[PDB]
């Protein structure tokens, strides 16, 4: 029940959302992995720009 003034607000937590929460504890581990993989690809394409084409 609403009590005296406030946004009549609609949250979208009626489905079973806690079954599909996606945490981000990866992200540092991820960020590194990309970065290694990046440095490897440079080293493979030896004098070619790391960039791409």
């Amino acid at each position: 029940a609403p009590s005296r003034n406030g946004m009549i607000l609609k949250p979208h937590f009626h489905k079973d959302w806690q079954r599909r929460v996606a945490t981000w504890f990866n992200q540092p581990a991820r960020k590194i992995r990309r970065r290694k993989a990046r440095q490897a690809r440079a080293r493979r394409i030896a004098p070619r720009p790391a960039s791409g084409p």
């Binding site: 029940a1 609403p2 009590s3 005296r4 003034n5 406030g6 009549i8 609609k10």
Partner: protein
């Protein structure tokens, strides 16, 4: 910080701050915005005048970038450029007037709030107000349309 919160101070007391005549039952009003019309109506129509009902035209595939038109007021037009354009001017003695490309700085329209200092300009912009035009002319300048 649980340490600071209220339930630490309620420990010992029976009702936990929810009273003992009426209690803390689950959902006595109904869940959420239930009763907007019936039984919660007064709150809705004294803090949300106009919740209920349709109005105006539908618009199916709205794409916001078509209507993109960020405005800027004369108020702070000279802010767009380095002070030393506004200084090398009120000086110079050619009656030059420096250009101000407003679209470069990220505003499309030029509306007309504020006093513009007596110091000629050439304002390039996608759109202008009527008043913004007038003020600009009164300074001794020239509005300039750009695509």
């Amino acid at each position: 910080p649980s340490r600071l919160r209220k339930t630490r101070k309620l420990r010992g007391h029976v009702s936990h701050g929810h009273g003992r005549i009426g209690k803390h039952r689950k959902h006595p009003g109904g869940r959420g915005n239930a009763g907007g019309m019936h039984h919660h109506r007064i709150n809705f129509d004294k803090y949300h005048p106009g919740y209920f009902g349709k109005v105006g035209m539908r618009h199916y595939h709205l794409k916001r970038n078509q209507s993109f038109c960020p405005t800027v007021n004369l108020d702070k037009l000279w802010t767009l450029v380095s002070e030393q354009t506004r200084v090398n001017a009120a000086k110079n003695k050619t009656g030059a007037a420096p250009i101000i490309d407003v679209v470069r700085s990220g505003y499309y329209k030029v509306l007309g709030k504020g006093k513009l200092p007596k110091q000629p300009v050439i304002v390039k912009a996608k759109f202008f107000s009527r008043r913004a035009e007038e003020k600009i002319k009164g300074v001794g300048g020239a509005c300039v349309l750009v695509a």
